[PDB]
């Protein structure tokens, strides 16, 4: 026990952008998120339900146009991406809440 045991200091979420441009790759990856509350917050359940409503998509999904999620359905119908996924990464007191997606160079705007 005793001396030399630190606690974790909170981590400042910044809200910024990091764009690694590389036209040599054939599909773009994009990951956007806002700051999440973290592990213990009861708010996580509701956050997880809204995410579930947006859900995920992948080009091998059966049922495209008829999918419940408007994102997925519009995505599937207009071929706006190859895949997307919502997420809620929890860390102590903070987190990443958002979605990630993969798409053609001319679809990033629409997908966003």
């Amino acid at each position: 026990d005793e001396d030399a045991v630190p606690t974790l200091s909170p981590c400042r979420f910044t809200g910024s952008q990091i764009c690694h441009r590389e036209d040599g790759l054939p599909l773009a990856h994009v990951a956007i998120a806002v700051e999440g509350p973290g592990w213990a917050h009861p708010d996580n359940v509701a956050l997880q339900v809204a995410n579930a409503i947006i859900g995920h998509y992948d080009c091998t999904y059966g049922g495209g146009a008829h999918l419940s999620s408007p994102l997925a359905s519009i995505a599937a119908t207009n071929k706006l991406c190859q895949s997307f996924q919502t997420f809620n990464i929890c860390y102590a007191d903070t987190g990443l809440l958002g979605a990630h997606f993969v798409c053609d160079h001319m679809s990033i705007d629409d997908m966003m």
């Binding site: 910044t14 809200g15 910024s16 952008q17 990091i18 764009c19 690694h20 441009r21 590389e22 036209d23 040599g24 160079h105 001319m106 990033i108 705007d109």
Partner: protein, 75 residues
């Protein structure tokens, strides 16, 4: 034509950016600000100023010669 997505080809360049709600709109406004402007002035005076003073001299002279040509002494 035009449009993003079809402008040109670029690879290997990263760009770090920051939300405007996270930074100040006037960082070191006078601190770095004024030095810069002096620098820019210095960078361009020798190219911009000379024609203007040349006009200025021709302006004040030309004016004096006009006024002083319309008086007479002997003859």
């Amino acid at each position: 034509g035009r449009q993003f997505g079809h402008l040109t080809r670029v690879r290997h360049v990263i760009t770090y950016s920051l939300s405007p709600f996270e930074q100040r709109a006037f960082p070191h406004y006078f601190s770095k600000g004024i030095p810069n402007v002096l620098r820019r002035t210095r960078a361009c005076i020798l190219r911009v100023a000379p024609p203007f003073v040349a006009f200025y001299l021709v302006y004040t002279w030309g004016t004096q010669e006009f006024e002083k040509s319309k008086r007479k002494n002997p003859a």
